[PDB]
Design a protein around this ligand. Sequence first.
Ligand SMILES: CC(=O)N1c2ccccc2N(Cc2ccccc2C(=O)O)C[C@@H]1C1CC1
Length: 113
Amino acid sequence: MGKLSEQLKHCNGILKELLSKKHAAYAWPFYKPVDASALGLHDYHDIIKHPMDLSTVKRKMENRDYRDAQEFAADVRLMFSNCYKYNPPDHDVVAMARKLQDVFEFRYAKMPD
Ligand SMILES: CC(=O)N1c2ccccc2N(Cc2ccccc2C(=O)O)C[C@@H]1C1CC1
């Protein structure tokens, strides 16, 4: 009934969409934590102090970690910012981040209030 719960439902709906087949062509790099060692990215954790990805956001939502929409949004945007920080701006993953963030921002803006 409460507004914070309603706003978190909206957040959970967004999260579901971001993880859906509809956006999978560009969302997939953000599905799981960056495995720096496996990708040979030995500077990743020197550059990115707070890694974030959609499975972590999903775990946090499932664990009732997010107390409000703003906290949820902060993690999703952190995930995109990390991508923009680490990768040169002309890399394919940055194009995919921008597209997925477009999905996120436009639906997030329809927050019930
Ligand atoms: C989330 C994130 O920033 N990353 C990411 C995360 C998980 C999986 C892949 C990636 N990609 C790689 C990648 C994406 C898309 C298309 C091709 C490639 C390619 O291999 O050239 C890059 C980057 C890595 C930080 C460099």
